[PDB]
Paper text:
Clostridial collagenases are among the most efficient enzymes to degrade by far the most predominant protein in the biosphere. Clostridia employ collagenases for nutrition (e.g. saprophytic strains) and host colonization (1–3). They are large multidomain proteins of ∼115 kDa belonging to the gluzincin superfamily of metalloproteases.
The stabilizing interactions of the helper subdomain with the upper segment and, to a lower extent, with the lower catalytic segment are reflected by their contact areas of 1060 and 418 Å2 for ColG, 1046 and 347 Å2 for ColH, and 955 and 503 Å2 for ColT. The upper and lower segments form a 959-, 1115-, and 1359 Å2 contact area, respectively. Consequently, the contact area between the upper and lower catalytic subdomains is larger by 42% in ColT than in ColG. Similarly, the lower catalytic subdomain has more than 20% stabilizing interactions with the helper domain, together suggesting a considerably more rigid quaternary arrangement within the peptidase in ColT as compared with ColG and also ColH. Due to its location between the two catalytic helices, calcium binding braces the upper and lower half-domains of the peptidase and stabilizes thereby the zinc coordination. Notably, the peptidase domain of ColG from C. histolyticum showed a higher structural similarity to ColT from [name] than to ColH from C. histolyticum.
Numbering used by the authors: 339 to 730
The structure:
Amino acid sequence: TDINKLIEEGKKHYLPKTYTFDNGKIIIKAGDKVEESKIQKLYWASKEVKSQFHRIIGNDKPLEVGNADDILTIVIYNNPEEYKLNKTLYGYSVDNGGIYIEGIGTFFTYERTPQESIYSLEELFRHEFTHYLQGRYLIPGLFNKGDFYKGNNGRITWFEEGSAEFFAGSTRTSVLPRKSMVGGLSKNPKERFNADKLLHSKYSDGWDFYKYGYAFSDYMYNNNKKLFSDLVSTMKNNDVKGYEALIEESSKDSKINKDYEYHMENLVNNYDNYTIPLVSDDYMKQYDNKSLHEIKSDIEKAMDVKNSQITKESSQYFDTYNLKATYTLSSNKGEISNWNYMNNKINEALNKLDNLSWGGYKTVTAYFSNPRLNSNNEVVYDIVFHGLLSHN
Ligand SMILES: [Ca+2]
Ligand SMILES: [Zn+2]
């Protein structure tokens, strides 16, 4: 009689395990055969992707206050067959390898073998997690409802999907290319998308645009940071006309097309180097306990920041910390020079911490974001470092 109760019981049966992280801000519900070690890898993978995303997008403040994605729920069925039950249990399409629903802040997927998918669970999760990030920090309103989806519902599709594919390759220090994506790009240059074709792609065009959107995102990151910056700026601002104008300009630009084509050629040539950047074993090791005060002191030295705030959070297998500070640029040399300065500096800080004796520093992720000019017209950034404090 009580259908809702029966459904809750079914969820409990198929997803009997619950793992919580970050003082309850990440909840993972999973089948009894999904390994705890895998669950932990996904948590640390999420921090690598998060940090690269904030570095590039330049914002770590949710665009809206009080959305469902204040809590990220991850639902992992045991296998592809049990995943089909998600249509009945939760109500969402199971015709995919997983799906993120912004309105409930929930990603649904399943553990799988290499014979069931090209994509390992961590690889797929790293892609789909970026939809969560895009929904929260980059695209105003909800998916298929905000102003970016009105009128021309596919105007952002090439970027939303292409950038998700790209950010899946995040590491502690960069975003690296993915074999699964590069391998699909045509060996024949004449069959590859040009910029105009990509930048107007929609879901109804088929699925080739995902790989070419991936490649265009890697092209921007490595060779056209200004366009990447300019696009994300229009998105954060809900500036649909600005975005559209930028797409039209970029679609007709022969230098962008030449450089994009060259970049694809280089990706294809370097295919063997592009094994998916999955998280290191460094995250699973036990280390000595080290105090927050000492961690703060080391990070302040490595990054040249002062008066930082460090705070502990609890997960069920370990405690973590976030250190927050600001950094003021001695010299303003324009957007892209500043970006590179900060990206290099933050990576040098991570390298210095890595070279210290405490192994816990190998778990650290870091970003800079939200630049603004102070009263003396100096550029100030927010800085955040995240790391393991102690295993339980
Ligand atoms: Ca959103
Ligand atoms: Zn996607």
